[PDB]
Amino acid sequence: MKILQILSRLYVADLNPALEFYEELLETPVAMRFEIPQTGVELAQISTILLIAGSEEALKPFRNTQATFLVDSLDKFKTFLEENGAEIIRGPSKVPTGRNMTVRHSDGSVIEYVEHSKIELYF
Amino acid sequence: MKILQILSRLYVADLNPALEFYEELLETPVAMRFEIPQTGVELAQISTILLIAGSEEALKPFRNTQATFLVDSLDKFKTFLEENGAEIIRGPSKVPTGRNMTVRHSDGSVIEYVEHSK
Numbered sequence: 001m002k003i004l005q006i007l008s009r010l011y012v013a014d015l016n017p018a019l020e021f022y023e024e025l026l027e028t029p030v031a032m033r034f035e036i037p038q039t040g041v042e043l044a045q046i047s048t049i050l051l052i053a054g055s056e057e058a059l060k061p062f063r064n065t066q067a068t069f070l071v072d073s074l075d076k077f078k079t080f081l082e083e084n085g086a087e088i089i090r091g092p093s094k095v096p097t098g099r100n101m102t103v104r105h106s107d108g109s110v111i112e113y114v115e116h117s118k119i120e121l122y123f
Numbered sequence: 124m125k126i127l128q129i130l131s132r133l134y135v136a137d138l139n140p141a142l143e144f145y146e147e148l149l150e151t152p153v154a155m156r157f158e159i160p161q162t163g164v165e166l167a168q169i170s171t172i173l174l175i176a177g178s179e180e181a182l183k184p185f186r187n188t189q190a191t192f193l194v195d196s197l198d199k200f201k202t203f204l205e206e207n208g209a210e211i212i213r214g215p216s217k218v219p220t221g222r223n224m225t226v227r228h229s230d231g232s233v234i235e236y237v238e239h240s241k
Contacts, residue, residue, distance in 0.1 A: 003149055006171050008131045008190040012230040021207060021229060026126060048129050048171075049190075067131040067172075077148075084144065106144065107135040
């Protein structure tokens with residue numbers, strides 16, 4: 001059971017101008033774009049920030065998640081969480097990048113747990 | 124200028140029980156408690172997570188901030204931000220742990236920038 005990265009979430013109307021800003025602020029000339037199931041929402045990652053773009057209406061449900069935890073194994077965390085007062089409210093579900101699940105911790109925090117599959121050369 | 128860490132923020136009613144949970148969840152047996160100016164609010168850091176504890180009312184204002192960026196130079200970032208469409212909402216202000224400020228980026232994101240010097 002290992003947390004690989006803790007990703008902070010930001011919500012914006014459009015990725016383009018926002019990305020340019022974060023590439024400058026974080027002094028990182030590249031960002032990742034992910035294939036996702038939700039329509040009307042675009043996802044990008046720069047440094048440890050996940051930029052979620054879409055209309056205020058499309059973004060509303062996404063704002064309920066406090067942060068995203070990239071982990072080595074969803075199953076290991078699922079077990080720990082269920083045995084520690086947490087409620088699995090979505091998934092585990094297969095997604096283009098691997099598998100995800102959304103969890104409500106006992107303290108009320110809502111966290112998205114993500115597990116990335118293989119997928120190879122951009123660097 | 125560099126962003127040293129990007130801290131995600133979680134809001135809870137009581138720090139102690141939550142701290143124990145996250146130490147186990149993140150397999151991190153040590154957390155840091157900070158002396159802060161606010162009253163009725165307790166702040167702890169575990170890994171790159173900031174746990175903010177207090178009443179629903181005491182926490183309300185803190186929830187308006189999406190994340191906290193720890194930087195090496197608050198002044199340099201203030202200049203960069205003001206020159207790149209961001210608005211300085213609060214601060215820079217002196218606090219027990221150094222200095223911080225709240226900023227609203229052009230895209231609407233509200234971020235707390237913090238500088239440690241003690």
